[PDB]
Design a protein around this nucleic acid. Structure first.
Lengths: 117, 117
DNA sequence: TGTACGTACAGT
DNA sequence: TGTACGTACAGT
């Protein structure tokens, strides 16, 4: 069905406000938070059990919201290290979808200063 | 004459091998090192007195060599902080040139994963 | 600024 | 991995 588009890093932030435990090398789920009064483009980050860990960094969510809202790609997330950080942790992301959507995803990331590695 | 194209960060590396002193907020000069056997795209970084400080990071020089070699832009460099680092220091760069060359510079940076901020 | 934090692990 | 290093200074 869906094919791989590529990979990208970013960060989970606001760890200080949530209690959802993450382990190194563990997947996390990205879920849009459209009614967030602080950022309309907000994207929450949950652990494998559905417990919130934090949010995607503001700038990254600025890029990704359009992709998620328009079902242009499914975004997988893995935390490579620093599961025990205080404030922030790194996020390895992979984008999957229909071949015909790759350009639109690639451009939406470029428009915000991100590039599919 | 020349007009501003914009700004970009990178890093000076290999500080360990040179003795050229830099102070915070001081300009540095970029000079191509074309006969470098380790990297053909090498770009040296000198202090205001002409003493070598280090090199542009490999990836960044990969982007910039073409720009410098083809006189597409003049690149100014300022070290914002960390003049007393051990191995690496940050570099705020600004690109100046003829209006008609901006696109070519912008694209050459994109091709290597850099963007004019 | 100094320091508490994040993370690379040290040219070209 | 732990740690020596670089640098942000701590959601959305």
């Amino acid at each position: 069905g869906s094919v791989l588009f590529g990979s990208l890093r970013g960060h989970v932030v606001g760890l200080r406000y949530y209690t959802g435990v993450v382990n190194n090398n563990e997947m996390v789920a990205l879920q849009r938070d459209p009614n967030n009064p602080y950022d309309k483009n907000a994207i929450k980050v949950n652990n494998v059990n559905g417990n919130q860990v934090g949010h995607l960094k503001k700038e990254l969510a600025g890029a990704l919201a359009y992709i998620m809202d328009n079902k242009l790609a499914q975004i997988e997330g893995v935390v490579p290290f620093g599961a025990n950080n205080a404030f922030t942790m790194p996020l390895h992301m992979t984008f999957w979808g229909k071949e015909e959507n790759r350009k639109a995803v690639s451009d939406q990331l470029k428009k915000h200063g991100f590039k599919l590695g």
